[PDB]
Design an enzyme around this catalytic site. Sequence first.
Site, short mmCIF file in Angstrom:
data_model
loop_
_atom_site.label_atom_id
_atom_site.label_comp_id
_atom_site.label_asym_id
_atom_site.label_seq_id
_atom_site.Cartn_x
_atom_site.Cartn_y
_atom_site.Cartn_z
CB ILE A 36 -4.72 -5.07 -6.99
CG1 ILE A 36 -4.23 -6.00 -8.10
CG2 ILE A 36 -6.14 -5.57 -6.86
CD1 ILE A 36 -3.84 -7.74 -6.83
CD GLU A 84 5.15 -6.97 -5.68
OE1 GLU A 84 5.95 -7.18 -7.06
OE2 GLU A 84 4.30 -6.97 -5.06
NE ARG A 136 4.54 -4.46 -9.84
CZ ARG A 136 4.46 -3.70 -9.15
NH1 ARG A 136 4.24 -4.80 -7.39
NH2 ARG A 136 3.09 -3.35 -8.31
O1 LIG Z 1 2.53 0.39 -2.56
C1 LIG Z 1 2.20 -1.34 -2.90
C2 LIG Z 1 1.94 -1.61 -4.22
O2 LIG Z 1 0.50 -2.43 -4.15
C3 LIG Z 1 2.36 -3.25 -4.05
O3 LIG Z 1 2.26 -3.81 -5.48
C4 LIG Z 1 1.99 -3.80 -3.66
O4 LIG Z 1 2.03 -3.31 -2.05
C5 LIG Z 1 2.12 -1.83 -1.42
O5 LIG Z 1 2.64 -2.15 -0.63
#
Ligand SMILES: O[C@@H]1[C@H](O)[C@H](O)CO[C@H]1O
Length: 246
Positions: A71, A160, A163
């Site tokens: 994001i 998440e 994913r």
């Molecule tokens: O770098 C990562 C990515 O942004 C993840 O999807 C969200 O958290 C962070 O630690």
Amino acid sequence: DVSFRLSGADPSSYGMFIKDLRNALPHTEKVYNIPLLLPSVSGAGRYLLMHLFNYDGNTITVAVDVTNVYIMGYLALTTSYFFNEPAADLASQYVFRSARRKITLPYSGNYERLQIAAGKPREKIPIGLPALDTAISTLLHYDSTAAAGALLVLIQTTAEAARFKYIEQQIQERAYRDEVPSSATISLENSWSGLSKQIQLAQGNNGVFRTPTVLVDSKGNRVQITNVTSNVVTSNIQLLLNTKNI
Ligand SMILES: O[C@@H]1[C@H](O)[C@H](O)CO[C@H]1O
Ligand SMILES: *[C@@H]1O[C@H](CO)[C@@H](O)[C@H](O)[C@H]1NC(C)=O
């Protein structure tokens, strides 16, 4: 674009949203039957817009980089908000340019920085559909500390879950009652880049990881993932971060 409405939401409609979200991400190749996100996308096509509506029908639009499901920022009424990091500044050149004002949040988008801003770790923040309704509502009006927790909820319940089927299911279980993420959920989140890399390296290596990935399972037990026959690979992960981005 993709959309999700909290008014009347249920496990089915959330599952449809997560499906739409996955399907909105471009790929030209699958690796072990899992879509491989692109190395890069040029211009505005890099960003997917997610329209999220709280229970009252108020809305924010969230910009997501389609190469990594990160994001970048969001629009709430006439104000845009972006993480304080170069990828998000870049995004602000392409999305929400019609906002009357742009606020740069006083943190980047990574979990460590967001948890620092929120004053608590992910482990202690309940997630679920009600939490997502709260998160949308919080983001409507600027409050950086509150926004950090809201963003921790938003990231886990959208990106998440896209994913990992396990994480989508965890949120579906929390349709009407929030609960802190399982240790397995946190483990998967933390391991997405590692797993994506190892699944790609396994092509050329007879399905075997060059380096084992350690995960926490549903029972709270630490386990080693060493090859593509693992349930995490065959029946959980849904998107691969391209190794060119690792
Ligand atoms: O770098 C990562 C990515 O942004 C993840 O999807 C969200 O958290 C962070 O630690
Ligand atoms: C592949 O992974 C499974 C665990 O799912 C394990 O039982 C098996 O021994 C592994 N094989 C190799 C060659 O790593």
